[PDB]
Design an enzyme around this catalytic site. Sequence first.
Site, PDB file in Angstrom:
ATOM      1  N   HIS A   1      25.642  69.585  89.346  1.00  0.00           N
ATOM      2  CA  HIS A   1      27.016  69.194  89.670  1.00  0.00           C
ATOM      3  C   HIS A   1      28.066  69.936  88.827  1.00  0.00           C
ATOM      4  O   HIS A   1      29.264  69.655  88.981  1.00  0.00           O
ATOM      5  CB  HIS A   1      27.197  67.663  89.588  1.00  0.00           C
ATOM      6  CG  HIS A   1      27.212  67.101  88.199  1.00  0.00           C
ATOM      7  ND1 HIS A   1      26.130  66.449  87.648  1.00  0.00           N
ATOM      8  CD2 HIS A   1      28.195  67.053  87.264  1.00  0.00           C
ATOM      9  CE1 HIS A   1      26.438  66.041  86.425  1.00  0.00           C
ATOM     10  NE2 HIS A   1      27.689  66.386  86.174  1.00  0.00           N
TER      11      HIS A   1
ATOM     12  N   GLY B   1      31.342  65.227  79.855  1.00  0.00           N
ATOM     13  CA  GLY B   1      30.929  66.521  79.339  1.00  0.00           C
ATOM     14  C   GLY B   1      29.558  66.568  78.695  1.00  0.00           C
ATOM     15  O   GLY B   1      29.112  67.661  78.322  1.00  0.00           O
TER      16      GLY B   1
ATOM     17  N   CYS C   1      26.664  66.090  80.125  1.00  0.00           N
ATOM     18  CA  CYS C   1      25.569  66.432  81.015  1.00  0.00           C
ATOM     19  C   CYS C   1      25.007  67.803  80.647  1.00  0.00           C
ATOM     20  O   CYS C   1      25.715  68.687  80.149  1.00  0.00           O
ATOM     21  CB  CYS C   1      26.025  66.376  82.470  1.00  0.00           C
ATOM     22  SG  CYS C   1      26.248  64.648  83.019  1.00  0.00           S
TER      23      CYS C   1
HETATM   24  C1  LIG Z   1      27.963  54.257  90.636  1.00  0.00           C
HETATM   25  C2  LIG Z   1      26.846  54.904  89.827  1.00  0.00           C
HETATM   26  C3  LIG Z   1      25.901  53.823  89.321  1.00  0.00           C
HETATM   27  C4  LIG Z   1      26.073  55.888  90.692  1.00  0.00           C
HETATM   28  N1  LIG Z   1      27.383  55.638  88.660  1.00  0.00           N
HETATM   29  C5  LIG Z   1      28.301  56.629  88.658  1.00  0.00           C
HETATM   30  O1  LIG Z   1      28.966  56.966  89.662  1.00  0.00           O
HETATM   31  N2  LIG Z   1      28.487  57.220  87.454  1.00  0.00           N
HETATM   32  C6  LIG Z   1      29.421  58.310  87.233  1.00  0.00           C
HETATM   33  C7  LIG Z   1      28.662  59.521  86.687  1.00  0.00           C
HETATM   34  O2  LIG Z   1      27.962  59.431  85.685  1.00  0.00           O
HETATM   35  N3  LIG Z   1      28.782  60.688  87.345  1.00  0.00           N
HETATM   36  C8  LIG Z   1      29.531  60.905  88.594  1.00  0.00           C
HETATM   37  C9  LIG Z   1      29.255  62.349  88.968  1.00  0.00           C
HETATM   38  C10 LIG Z   1      28.387  62.955  87.880  1.00  0.00           C
HETATM   39  C11 LIG Z   1      28.150  61.899  86.816  1.00  0.00           C
HETATM   40  C12 LIG Z   1      28.799  62.320  85.502  1.00  0.00           C
HETATM   41  O3  LIG Z   1      30.015  62.233  85.332  1.00  0.00           O
HETATM   42  N4  LIG Z   1      27.964  62.751  84.556  1.00  0.00           N
HETATM   43  C13 LIG Z   1      28.445  63.116  83.235  1.00  0.00           C
HETATM   44  C14 LIG Z   1      28.008  64.532  82.891  1.00  0.00           C
HETATM   45  N5  LIG Z   1      28.652  65.283  82.059  1.00  0.00           N
HETATM   46  C15 LIG Z   1      27.940  62.115  82.191  1.00  0.00           C
HETATM   47  C16 LIG Z   1      28.597  60.731  82.295  1.00  0.00           C
HETATM   48  C17 LIG Z   1      30.094  60.719  82.003  1.00  0.00           C
HETATM   49  C18 LIG Z   1      30.340  59.303  81.526  1.00  0.00           C
HETATM   50  N6  LIG Z   1      29.091  59.002  80.833  1.00  0.00           N
HETATM   51  C19 LIG Z   1      28.065  59.721  81.293  1.00  0.00           C
HETATM   52  O4  LIG Z   1      26.874  59.576  80.966  1.00  0.00           O
HETATM   53  C20 LIG Z   1      27.838  62.731  89.269  1.00  0.00           C
HETATM   54  C21 LIG Z   1      27.583  63.981  90.083  1.00  0.00           C
HETATM   55  C22 LIG Z   1      26.858  61.617  89.577  1.00  0.00           C
HETATM   56  C23 LIG Z   1      30.588  57.884  86.312  1.00  0.00           C
HETATM   57  C24 LIG Z   1      31.383  56.755  86.978  1.00  0.00           C
HETATM   58  C25 LIG Z   1      30.097  57.383  84.951  1.00  0.00           C
HETATM   59  C26 LIG Z   1      31.523  59.067  86.069  1.00  0.00           C
END
Ligand SMILES: CC(C)(C)NC(=O)N[C@H](C(=O)N1C[C@H]2[C@@H]([C@H]1C(=O)N[C@H](C=N)C[C@@H]1CCNC1=O)C2(C)C)C(C)(C)C
Lengths: 305, 305
Positions: free
Chosen positions: A41, A143, A145
């Site tokens: 992503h 950030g 990830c």
């Molecule tokens: C409803 C469900 C249970 C499925 N949850 C979420 O939607 N969760 C989302 C999330 O995690 N994301 C949304 C988007 C990213 C991925 C993402 O933002 N990852 C960060 C990487 N840098 C790591 C995060 C950032 C916060 N703390 C982490 O660990 C992808 C493609 C799934 C949110 C809401 C925490 C932003």
Amino acid sequence: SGFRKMAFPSGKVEGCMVQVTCGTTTLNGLWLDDVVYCPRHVICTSEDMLNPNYEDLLIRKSNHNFLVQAGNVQLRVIGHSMQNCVLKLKVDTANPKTPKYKFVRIQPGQTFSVLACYNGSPSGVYQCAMRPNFTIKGSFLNGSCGSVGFNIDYDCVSFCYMHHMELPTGVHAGTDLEGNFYGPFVDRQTAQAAGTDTTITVNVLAWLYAAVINGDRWFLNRFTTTLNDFNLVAMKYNYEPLTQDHVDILGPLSAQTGIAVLDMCASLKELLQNGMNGRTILGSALLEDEFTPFDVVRQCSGVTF
Amino acid sequence: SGFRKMAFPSGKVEGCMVQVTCGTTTLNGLWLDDVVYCPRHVICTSEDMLNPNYEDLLIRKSNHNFLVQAGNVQLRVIGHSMQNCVLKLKVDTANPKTPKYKFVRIQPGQTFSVLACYNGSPSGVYQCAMRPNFTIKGSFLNGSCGSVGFNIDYDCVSFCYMHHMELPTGVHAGTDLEGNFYGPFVDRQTAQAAGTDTTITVNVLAWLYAAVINGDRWFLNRFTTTLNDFNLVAMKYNYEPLTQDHVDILGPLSAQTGIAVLDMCASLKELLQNGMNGRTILGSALLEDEFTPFDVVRQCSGVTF
Ligand SMILES: CC(C)(C)NC(=O)N[C@H](C(=O)N1C[C@H]2[C@@H]([C@H]1C(=O)N[C@H](C=N)C[C@@H]1CCNC1=O)C2(C)C)C(C)(C)C
Ligand SMILES: CC(C)(C)NC(=O)N[C@H](C(=O)N1C[C@H]2[C@@H]([C@H]1C(=O)N[C@H](C=N)C[C@@H]1CCNC1=O)C2(C)C)C(C)(C)C
């Protein structure tokens, strides 16, 4: 003596962390030989993540759209592909700090160290367990990830986790390094539910052996039990069934302390049924399930890498 | 989100760890530029440690009696001296992996990461606090001496602890890197007593701010208190006095959450007087005092190095 939640030394993994930027999104990648592994992503805008078509978004990227930076040095990208939920960016430079490594898929109940990173730079290191519901209890911000989890065996780093997303209650989900998610999760910002978590019985027993080794012995009772009777009792307290494979794995700690595993099960049974009565074990008021049997031996015997 | 006991990345310190052997005793040393720092009781037999005369034992050693090994490479020793309880072994080779570093003496209440080592090799990393009685709650076995504790600030490693000895109840004592002990301890195997420990009030408050940031808010009450009244109440629960310097240091967390420090003191007061009533805070059943205010900000804001 003393017993702490201990992480692996992270130096070998620190030497592999890089920053990956595509358009406006920046996250972390893992650089091993001439390949950078990172979550797919990175190719998304915020709007894309509500419902992304990754194959479609990747088709319109070319090598030069990926800005990969190791410290203050841009690495030139010379090919790219998607494997499940990770991207592999082939670069023109092999990482000279690459450790001996393996990619492994861990089992629920196993532990690993996480090196949390931002913008390709390490922030801290902590120890996690893969929960039975295939989540981990991490500490991750925007950030983070591409941060990875790992174990070390002598000289060999076994990478087992890459971080992708956060679930309700500070719960985290990710993939192995082939990009396959642990658990029934997808990398899409839409409602998804984790299963119910359960307590890792074999790890609780390992931790009780650590307590005995450390001289915290008040909870040892005079009884034994059968494996069957223990599992009937543990079931209503939301503990995993203890299998004979688990008993065999507890062999070294049992033999070292002279306490048969089923005798320790009889002690755990009493703790579950009666509580702690206001006492602690290794300083903790709650039973702890994020030390494996190997973690206990490693710490109490001083295994190095 | 999520909140874990997080250690600094240890790579920079791993590159400095060596093994020091004199006669039959082997422990760890820290190699920075052309000097190896290690605990002076490497020059002891087991019998000497009951009552050593270190000056006398050192007089009969020469440079060549110290076997210093960085991995599989012997470093040639070309001078030696004793500074308080550490030895400085000058070697003919500067460590090319030396980080930017400082030697600092930390204050009770401050935290640091420990890289536990055996035979010059890292075993694990964990986070500790210098207790008010100048001990730490570590995890150390035979051969761990010379393991160091540190903090990192951007690129700079501040070394603040070197491990020397263990006290009743899995308690550990050591020196700063000039070889001066923390606390009223000497490096002799004879009865010595630690003072009574107390709870680090300012760190408990920092951790309660971390809880609020993480959405664990059940303990916030509607009250404020004065600093004086809080300290009268905390005193009987064996908490450190909270000073105005502590309140100022809590400023960033207070301003970020919108919760005045004295309002958080009113909440802590109620927890101390009424207990947790069977609830947890950030998963813990006990109030936690080994996160400083800077630790909380560092983790919740993702500071990197
Ligand atoms: C409803 C469900 C249970 C499925 N949850 C979420 O939607 N969760 C989302 C999330 O995690 N994301 C949304 C988007 C990213 C991925 C993402 O933002 N990852 C960060 C990487 N840098 C790591 C995060 C950032 C916060 N703390 C982490 O660990 C992808 C493609 C799934 C949110 C809401 C925490 C932003
Ligand atoms: C009575 C009193 C409160 C003072 N305690 C002790 O005597 N304690 C002793 C101890 O620690 N030592 C005795 C001898 C060493 C120093 C030493 O063995 N240090 C290890 C370094 N490698 C690190 C230890 C090893 C065990 N766990 C550690 O942390 C010196 C010179 C003081 C013992 C009994 C734990 C061995």
